[PDB]
Each structure stands twice: as structure tokens, then as C-alpha cells.
Design a protein around this ligand. Structure first.
Ligand SMILES: Cc1cc2nc3c(=O)[nH]c(=O)nc-3n(C[C@H](O)[C@H](O)[C@H](O)COP(=O)(O)O)c2cc1C
Ligand SMILES: Cc1cc2nc3c(=O)[nH]c(=O)nc-3n(C[C@H](O)[C@H](O)[C@H](O)COP(=O)(O)O)c2cc1C
Lengths: 339, 331
């Protein structure tokens, strides 16, 4: 296959970079198993970043994927922020709380340059051409997420080596960047074959790929690989919180929705009180990534009391594939139905 | 893969989707003759035309046919909602102006005893359902969620149509108004198959050989295909619907209640963009039609799809201008 050769990996599974639930130990296990392991870097300081890459490199020399956000920083909006804070006042009262990141840059480049990742993935489009040329000159393949056909064509045109097609079924943030209109986005079943028809480069399927059968359906459609997120979230290598783990296993896990309430940007998570009462979508939330600061305390407080009411419970529309077995074992689950 | 071909008495595991007001006996015949299951949509039909269309089908094939009804509950009286809504459309007016399945339908159906009877928006009463089973006829219905699937199986459905969000036309939900409970085919299909014992038909974005293959891979017993039949000459799709389907506008669709009162997937036009696509002010199901019925005749006459219900799935690329029989086999 085209991506196994291009990436130098055995199996056409990519473990989805999932910021906040996961680091080196899951990336190591999946790359050692023969797929592509992924380090989410969106929330890492430069110190954490270098540490975590050093930890990866001293347990495997197999390929890995380091992931970054390259969104536009929002624009000052202290008042929009203050108005949102005012709206949450009732929760602050209830929980007795006193209310009292950062796109890929040259700074992250300098650290990456020491390690030279086999792949560099981006969410929310691509960085500037210079940053991109710097990356390519490490030997790194560059991939990014498309949620429409137009986005896929934009990525090809700007030199992406592969496109991640994420259907609406996907957990975590929508990686859209040409349009704010969510009705332009498609489910996996329709996005995948339409992106493959439009581009010449390889296409990775993301959104609802949770098991052998679904991996098979994806490849049948002409995907060169699959990116799998939600179905690793119960693996011991994952740092998924007890309360997030509990939600995934409950029958609430089946009902998810797109919400901007936690971050400023549409993301899919298990439906909770905060989303039901204030959303799921809300036009008053500040631009990404400002909104996190306003719920950080509530989340902490409500989790401490064992409520998942104010948590970002990122999860796709098929939770049925999550299993508490080693991620290497699980990565092999996924490839049984392939030739 | 064969549980349904056996069960329905058909050659191929392809069901042509019943599509009200776009499609009648000519398409059902052509697909049922071709070895798939052809469908007559009866939601929008008087008893006269119900009987005429069934008579027409039986006079041309003896092969199995599917007949489709709505069994939505009828809406409470709401003339003040209706009057208000008309008020909002006033600037448009200026720009140019100013039934569920029942014993009735059953009496006509009993003359023909059709091989399958399909329902949108749940199931009818126990009594009407037993009546249909006594003809030897198979009853199927749409689920948009796993709970809906299980509820249909427990009340005696012979198979489940799982319609993913990609599907064209009305959403067939009946347990929750919450659209966020619903699912794209890729996730709905496998979770319904895991949940139920009876066969599962896949609906929403099945448009070609590859997608059919991909749905069967996941363990569908059969596929239901609507959008991709719409350019077939046997289909009575309107000249401007045809034009919309072949333009780049087709690629963009959205769920909208503006034409009927219920959420249906159609190509985004001016009315949807300006007034919607979703608007809490539009009267309940079946009532909203009369509000825009005239604006469409008006608008379509001068060549505009600005006020048409241009219903279409999220994959329009398998539409082909060839006979329905060819297309059915190409799947
Ligand atoms: C908890 C969680 C965290 C995620 N974090 C990221 C991230 O940091 N960067 C990124 O590009 N994508 C992220 N994703 C998106 C995945 O790359 C992928 O699109 C998605 O998980 C696919 O759908 P699935 O969850 O059904 O496997 C995340 C998804 C989840 C569920
Ligand atoms: C123009 C059009 C009309 C439809 N009419 C009906 C109908 O009368 N009754 C019904 O139960 N389903 C109806 N559907 C829904 C189909 O039965 C099916 O759920 C859907 O078309 C499958 O998705 P696809 O359009 O991607 O093939 C219609 C769909 C379209 C596009």
C-alpha cells in the first residue's frame, strides 16, 4: 500500500493524536506494534515537548507522527470574554468558585529539528510556506485534516503528502478551516469516497473506525490507511481520566454532539449538563482557544465531586470499540480483515 | 447478504428508495423487473391514485414491490402559528401573491397484498400492523438511532432501514426531536447490526458499487438507494431539481424544516440560507407546505430553485442519466 511504503510502517493504522489523554507510552506501543503512533503536541510546553520526544526515541526507532495546531490566534475580545463569564455566574455560585494553546511556530520547529519526525500532522490546515519547507527538509511527510472536498484540494495544492478525511462521526475538534458553516461537513461514508475522487494523493480515513469490520469498510472505499482515536481511549497506555473512562463505558457515551462550550471551536463529546443547558452550540463563547479558561475551575470542582457535568468528554459516534487491553494488542485487532 | 433476498423474493440486495412526488410506478416496475426491490411512495397519494398506481404496477410485473407510507401523528391545531409564519414570508410574497396510514389506505392495499410495506416515522397501531402481516406481507421501517431500531424489532418489524444523516429527504426519527442523537451511516449501521437480530438495510450515501460494497462489508443484508436514481428517465424528477443535482450547489446540503415542518436533507437554496435552514417558527409537520407551495410554483416558473424542496443526500456523484435497470445492476 501507498502509505505503508511512504511512511515506512507495517500496518495502515494511525493512532489519532489525542491531546490531553495521551503521550509517549501510547505512541510507542502503536509504532512498536507496526502502525503509526502519534504524539499530540498542542498542549505541550517546549520542555514537555522535548521530554516526550526523547522518551519516544529511547524505546523505539520506528516511525512516529507529531501533531500540532496551526489555527489563527483569535483577536482581542476581553469583553466577549467578560460577557461569557457573566453568563456562567450561576455555576460559579453553585460550586462556590472564584474565577481568580498557541499555534505551531519557529519555537516548536527548533525542538522538532533535533528529532526529525517521520510525519508531522496539523489540525486546522497548514502553517506558512516557510515553516512547511523547513519541515519537508527534515525528510518529514506532512499530513493535515480535511472536512470537505474544498479543504482537501487546498491541502493538496499546498503540498500535503496525505489528507486525513474526518467525518462528522469523529471525536474531538472539527479540523475545518475554510468555513465556519458546519452544514458543509459530511459523515465518513460520504466524505471519504468524495475526497478520494477529487485528489491524487493518499487518503486516511478518520471518524468511526473502531474495529476490524470498520477498518475493512474504510479500505474497501479506497482509503490508504485509517486514523483511529476513540477506540484507544480505554487502553492502559492512555492517560484518559477515571471520570472520562466511566463516561465512555456508560450508555450516555452513545449520545454525543458538537459543542464549542469548552474551547471556542466545534468539538464532539459525550453530552453533559453543561452542553444540554448552555448549548450544545453557543454563539456567545469566545474564539478558540480562549473559552477553556472560563470552565477550567468548574470542571476541576465538578470532577473532584465525581460529576462529569463540566468535562470535555471527547468521543466519536461509535464508542463500541473501546477495550481495556494493551494498545499493541488492539492495534493488531484492527488489521485481521485485510489482505 | 442473502437473508433479505430470500425473505423478499428478489434477485439482488438493492431497494430503490420510495421518494414521494419525484417518482411513481415507472421506477418501481423498472427496478423490480431488474431484480431489485422497487418502491411506490404513497404518502402524497389519494386513494384513487394509490389504487391506480398499484393496478399499474401489477399489470406490468409480478415481481415483488414495496409500498411506503408516513405514520406521523397528526399535529395539534395551530392557526396562530400558521398565520404568523405567513406574516414572515410577506416580503417574499411581494417579490412575486396572497394523512397518516389508516384503515382507508389499508382497504385499498388489501386488494393487492404487496410483498413489503415500509413506514416512515415509526409504525402504525397494532391492529393495522397485524392486518398487513396477514397478507403474508413484510413490514419494514426506518430507525435513525439504536433505541429506535430496538423498538421497531420489539413491535414486530421484519427488518430495519438504518438511515444515516447522509440520507436525502425527511429524517425518519420518531422517539426524540433531538437531532444530535442521530448518526452518520458509518456509525449507525454497525451499531444497529450489533443491537438487533433481524436483518438491516443500509440507507444514506449508497450511490455506487463501492459504497454498496462498503455497506455490505459491515454486514448490511441489503441497501436502500434514493438520491442516485434521480437522473434516471423513469424518475419524474423536475427539470430544475435535475439541474440542481448536476450543479456544484449539489455538494452542499442541510437539514431543513422550512418546506414541510419536519427536518429533511436538501440542497441549500436562498430560502434555506435566508430563513433557516432550521427555524422554530415553522408550523408542525405537514402544515408548512401550504405556506411555500405558491412561492415554489412562482419561483420555479421563472427558472429559480430558490424555494424548491431539492432533496438530495450528501453524496450526489453516483447520479447517472441511464435507465434505472442498468443502474440497479451496476450496483
Ligand atoms: C480525545 C480526543 C482528542 C483528540 N485530539 C486531537 C489533537 O490533539 N489533534 C488532532 O489533530 N486531532 C485530534 N483528535 C481527532 C482525531 O485525530 C480523529 O479525527 C478522531 O479521533 C477520529 O474519530 P474517532 O474518534 O471515531 O476515532 C482527537 C480526538 C479525540 C477523541
Ligand atoms: C427526493 C427524496 C424523496 C424521498 N422520499 C421518501 C418517502 O416518500 N418515503 C420515505 O420513507 N423515504 C423517503 N426518502 C428517504 C429514502 O427512503 C432514504 O432514506 C434516502 O434517500 C437514502 O439516502 P440517499 O438519498 O443518500 O440514498 C427520500 C429521499 C429523497 C432524496
Amino acid at each position: 500500500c501507498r502509505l505503508t511504503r511512504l511512511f515506512g510502517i507495517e500496518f495502515p493504522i494511525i493512532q489519532a493524536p489525542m491531546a490531553g489523554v495521551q503521550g509517549s507510552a501510547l505512541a510507542i506501543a502503536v509504532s512498536e506494534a507496526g502502525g503509526l503512533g502519534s504524539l499530540p503536541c498542542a498542549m505541550l510546553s517546549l520542555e514537555a515537548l522535548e521530554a516526550e520526544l526523547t522518551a519516544i526515541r529511547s524505546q523505539t526507532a520506528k516511525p512516529i507522527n507529531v501533531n500540532f495546531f496551526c489555527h489563527r490566534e483569535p483577536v482581542a475580545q476581553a469583553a466577549k470574554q467578560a460577557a461569557w463569564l457573566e453568563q456562567l455566574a450561576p455555576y460559579f455560585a453553585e460550586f462556590n468558585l472564584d474565577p481568580n494553546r498557541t499555534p505551531y511556530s519557529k519555537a516548536q520547529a527548533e525542538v522538532l529539528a533535533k528529532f526529525k519526525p517521520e510525519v508531522v500532522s496539523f489540525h486546522f490546515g497548514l502553517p506558512d510556506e516557510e515553516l512547511l519547507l523547513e519541515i519537508k527538509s527534515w525528510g518529514s511527510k506532512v499530513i493535515s485534516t480535511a472536512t470537505t472536498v474544498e479543504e482537501a484540494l487546498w491541502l493538496e495544492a499546498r503540498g500535503a503528502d496525505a489528507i486525513i478525511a474526518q467525518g462528522l462521526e469523529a471525536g474531538g475538534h472539527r479540523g475545518h478551516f475554510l468555513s465556519e458553516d458546519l452544514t458543509e461537513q459530511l459523515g465518513t461514508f460520504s466524505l471519504l469516497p468524495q475526497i478520494i475522487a477529487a485528489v491524487e494523493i493518499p487518503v486516511i480515513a478518520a471518524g468511526g473506525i473502531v474495529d476490524a469490520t470498520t477498518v475493512r469498510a474504510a479500505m474497501t472505499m479506497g482509503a490508504s490507511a485509517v486514523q483511529v482515536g476513540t477506540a484507544y481511549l480505554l487502553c492502559p497506555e492512555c492517560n484518559t481520566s477515571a471520570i472520562h473512562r466511566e463516561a465512555l463505558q456508560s450508555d450516555a457515551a452513545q449520545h454525543t454532539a458538537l459543542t464549542n462550550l469548552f474551547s471556542g471551536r466545534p468539538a464532539r463529546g459525550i453530552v453533559n449538563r453543561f452542553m444540554a443547558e448552555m448549548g450544545p452550540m453557543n454563539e456567545a463563547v469566545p474564539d478558540f482557544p480562549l473559552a477553556s479558561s472560563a470552565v477550567a475551575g468548574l470542571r476541576t470542582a465538578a470532577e473532584r465531586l465525581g460529576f462529569w457535568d463540566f468535562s470535555p468528554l471527547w468521543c466519536g459516534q461509535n464508542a463500541s470499540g473501546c477495550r481495556a487491553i494493551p494498545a499493541a494488542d488492539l492495534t493488531r485487532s484492527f488489521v485481521l480483515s485485510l489482505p
